[PDB]
Symmetry: D2
Subunit: 396 residues, 4 copies
């Protein structure tokens, strides 16, 4: 096995639906971090990149037909560089990092780029083909988020709960109160606003130029959030439920990318190694409670590595919904407000462009370890239709 | 330390023609067919111990949306505790699933996995971009069956957006592959596939698809009736001075395939029969305009790292997207146009090409053929739209 | 002051009526509309065609190949001179009849002398429609079928009037006017029996021009109406399930279908009859329209017939033929009952109706006029009434007298 | 009695005309059609509304929220009694004028006494259309825009007549009839100047019912026609580039645009005027249509005017107002020249026309009639002519006389 080092990493700001990045095609957006990596790392011989791996949950729109390859070509990497796109919905960008790790670890590759993209603003409508001449049964479905082309067999066996519905199932089954979710959301807003003001996100961000407007800041943050404002919101799924627009992430646009390399490649390309990847693990759960998916993923990873959850100096836990973030922490024995968890806030504040988020969590965990002087970091997130993914790193 | 990785049982659906025998089957349900078969066929496996299902799929806009690997494993009746992930390297997706599964076991992260691929090109949906402005008159529906959609003006101006048949004419022109040679290659594919079908070779690979019942059991795309004279009469797709025709190109098709990969420890624990060890996978990039010679850098990269000459392989499964690029690849790698180890059971010109499933089929058929021929090493390689190649090597145990 | 002019119907001709996705499904609406126009040209060689004042066509859809004024499209495709104007009318189900009555008013008022009136519908080829986005990045895009029934539903229409489907309104009529399932089925059976008899007798064949269809290995013709179910029995009708649920009454067997077809006829003043060597067959007496609640649209003919007969001073019982469109048996019976005509009165639909023959919306009303006249000629009757209901709650009625 | 009845236009009203995607773009076509109907109700409180015989509306599209007989949809949304029937006419650009003439013929022939005629178009909201698959798993699905222009093109129409866009036809007219770029631009400038003056004088305000629109922070009222470019100068028009290339003459500045609007007016027999307390303003004299080659559709008004004037015995020079639709300055001028009227004759479009005001197809023809009448009243003129061209090669003309 070879050690695998994460080197430079960079991301776009995250835009609101229909907001600052809505005019940027997914393929063009994915190319922005790749162009930045090139500019930032002048020792690299770019013809020696073995592969670009990108996560993307949609792939029906301008991200169609292997967006990783489209993006590397738009970014001006050589046409000799291959690319492949991953889809594990919400966890896609993290899967790209872990898959990139496995490829180097197994000695198949030396120098790779891993990232993720989503343009949920620009997600297309889809229409199935007619199954008979003169069919009257043609319909358009929205690919922005959630179920489309529903399978009756899936509905009858597992249900087709919307993501907020699953988050309410978790709140119910795991006993997570409305008040606890609102406090978690408020802390996310507060920590993200502080991190933004400190310039932490600015160090992770490459601005996007739109032909020229410059988009430099994450757009989704609500720094003025207060507990009173959150308490007044009506639950999405009816008055007896707990999940609201204020204690859940949104749909968003963004891209992120990072360099991974073997020891030999770090030396050859003049890279700065920042952390080594320890491992990645996945787990599956009932679709109806997909939010709890990180629990088996984290347990699998930590048991194989023999590292206690309490040993991590940062835990970046995706905040798809406060209810599931809290439920996961509670099962793993971590306090709802533990200082190592999401110290710069998370997706409730920052937004959630599905394919990008998992790459962002890895790069931000590493960034946070560097600033805090921490050693081990854990990134983990839930996945639609009942999965979890977890990835651990260690600063060098 | 690295672990050896063994391919065990492997199975596929038949390949359907566009709008043909499998056109009524949702891609997710179709992907679930080989999964259910692996379950029925391998009674010793403790199925709650599968670490991951990896599936290739090039489209993902239709009933294969939102991570078809996970959708299929749930529809196949595998426990909800088993994770799944879907890979897209267009034409090579299914082979990428196998190579990705291999790397997960080889690195010690997993012990028992399923790798496969699916495509329902019959059912590929139309797509329409959202309006960029209120009352926009610029709304357009685009076919996702095959080829470019949502064309990026910057891709077109830098690299061109040549259709797959256009890229195959570019390869024919640049590598000097004659119409006559292309037609001869296509005839050989038809004759070899027809012979393999008759010998029951494909039946050993095929699990039937049940449609609520009608049962689909046979590969539908083959044209055993093909003659050189009929091929010679066809007009080139892209105009009179070109060479690629419907008869020297593959088609658009439906199908799924899956196979078990396992560490030595998992082979023992689950009572599996190891059939080959995976040696490695490599990828390569080329200009989009000549995507069909993509396999050349991929094969050169893999063979140089493994220290195995191309001439050392006992079978070469080279995908036949187009006769022109099949021949160009062989010539570049120093292999005869009719070498007996290449595509001995025929290939995509006869069998069809459901993008996401094809690369998984090539791996499992290369293995099948090694067993039939008593061969040792096998190479599967294929081209990829927008200019890539992928290659994967196995050795029979 | 100026005297009103008498208006005569001369030759008339129709295509066969095709089943949805059936014999005429490959024929564009505009080309289909041109088929009876071409037949009229072939059939009447004394006519100086550059003297046609107007072509009026009914068409309920106009979103598909029938877009942008199908009347004008059809006349040009039929080879009529480009100097001839055309206009398309839409009163849904009654459009074809409205074309005839509108042509009649144009001649009666002295504005024209020689006109063609007809109707067309290709329901097979009716397209889907999609509204534009109201905002950038809208998630609210929808595709809707235009074959039949509501699309782009207005919330105010739904709250004030409802948006009942056509079969739902037929059930409302059956409920309100108390028309039994048994009576509906008996009516449908009589329609199939009478149409089967008329077809065997060659009655429809006298109305029909065949349609040429492009085909591998050489073009073929469609010669016969395709919708008829001559082998229908009471037992088979009784076994069908109601479309809207177990305690409803309207079924696929006691309702018309969705269908393809076109029809056209010449109307002329006395002077034009003389100039063009035409054979006048009937004088048009008048047309009237009526409105009713949308939820019971099938009863629309009742105010329309009352309006027309009271203005003309003719009792309903005085007509020798009544062609009442059979959108649904429930509404056909309800209309007859309100008007004091027996459920099986011999002068009503004597050659059957849309339950057997089918209902391509824009053509049906023209068909009813030409077939009423045809029947008057075969029976030696004098006065004819054609009437039909209209979606969203109307009725239309037109009276003719054989000459 | 057997004489034709005189037919009077009484009250008339219209919405402002909106730009594409502009001030009225959020109003559904059916709701927009209802706006002038609701105004007519408030404005004419002597009318017994359940005695209206028919509502006739022009509408060129009918695929969108205007589907399924917008006349009937609009009257129900306006709160008119459900007993009132309605019918929709399509002669493309001339639909709303055809509604008026058709309403006239219905009363003149003695079949009705009290009607509403009007027109509507919402080109902003015109939908996309998609043909059905003609085979299972068809890859040949596509969307076409119904905003304006050809869709579902028939290969036979293309081969025999061409499928020239409307600006291409306007260039053909400019070429064939020799209308210079300079003259087109001068005509366009006169239209803007006269419309700006009429607007400033409050002339359009007398024709307009304002439309209330909701915004986030409260409601606004759209009161004014949005299309006008009062800042237009010859120098500005001179710098525009021709739509169809450099030896061509038609530009965005010498052509109308695409637009949204609706209009309606009451027509009544003398007996209905007396019973419903109406104020008669003009008598309708008659309407005539004509056809020309599609490729020069802009010249269509010439046969139409010739036919109407010959039948009525009224010379073109006898009219105190001529409202000639300004689809394109090239065809406007060509028509005037063929009819023997000076390019800048003071009786022609005295308050400007569609280059300034915009052209919501189905509405325009109704607007021309009501504005001709309005102008006759202001100027003390007696007879008025409204005429316009039609896509695919027609013209329509309608004459009125102030009472
Ligand atoms: Cl989703
Ligand atoms: Cl493709
Ligand atoms: Cl309907
Ligand atoms: Cl148009
Ligand atoms: Cl005026």
């Amino acid at each position: 096995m070879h050690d695998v080092f994460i080197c430079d990493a960079i991301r776009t700001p995250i835009g609101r639906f229909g907001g600052a990045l809505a005019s940027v095609r997914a393929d063009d957006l994915a190319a922005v971090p790749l162009k930045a990596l090139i500019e930032r790392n002048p020792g690299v011989q770019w013809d020696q990149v073995d592969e670009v791996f990108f996560g993307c949950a949609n792939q029906a729109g301008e991200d169609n037909r292997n967006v990783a390859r489209m993006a590397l070509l738009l970014a001006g990497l050589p046409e000799s560089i291959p690319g492949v796109t991953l889809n594990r919905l919400c966890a896609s960008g993290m899967d790209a990092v872990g898959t990139a790790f496995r490829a180097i670890a197994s000695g198949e590759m030396e120098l790779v780029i891993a990232g993720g993209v989503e343009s949920m603003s620009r997600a297309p409508f889809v229409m199935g083909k007619a199954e008979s001449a003169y069919s009257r049964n043609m319909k358009l479905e929205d690919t922005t988020i959630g179920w489309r082309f529903i399978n009756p067999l899936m509905k009858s066996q597992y249900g087709v709960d919307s993501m907020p519905e699953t988050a309410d199932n978790v709140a119910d089954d795991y006993q997570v109160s409305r008040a606890d979710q609102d406090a978690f959301a408020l802390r996310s807003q507060q920590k993200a606003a502080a991190a933004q003001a400190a310039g932490f996100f600015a160090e992770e961000i490459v601005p996007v130029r739109i032909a020229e407007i410059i988009v430099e800041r994450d757009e989704h943050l609500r720094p003025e959030t207060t507990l009173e404002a959150l308490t007044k919101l009506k639950p999405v799924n009816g008055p007896d439920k707990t999940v609201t627009a204020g204690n859940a992430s949104g749909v968003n646009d963004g891209a992120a990318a990072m360099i991974l390399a073997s020891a030999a490649a770090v030396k050859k390309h003049g890279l700065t190694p920042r952390a080594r990847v320890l491992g990645m693990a996945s787990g599956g759960v009932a679709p109806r409670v997909m939010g709890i998916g990180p629990v088996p993923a984290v347990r699998k990873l930590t048991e194989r590595l023999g590292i206690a959850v309490s040993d991590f100096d940062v835990i970046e836990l995706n905040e798809a919904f406060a209810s599931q973030g809290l439920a996961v922490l509670r099962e793993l024995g971590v306090a709802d407000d533990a200082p190592q968890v999401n110290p710069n806030g998370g997706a409730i504040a920052l937004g959630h462009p599905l394919g990008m988020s998992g790459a962002r969590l890895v790069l931000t965990a590493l960034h946070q370890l560097e600033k805090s002087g921490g050693r081990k970091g854990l990134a983990t997130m839930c996945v639609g239709v009942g999965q979890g993914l977890a990835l651990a790193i260690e600063r060098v």
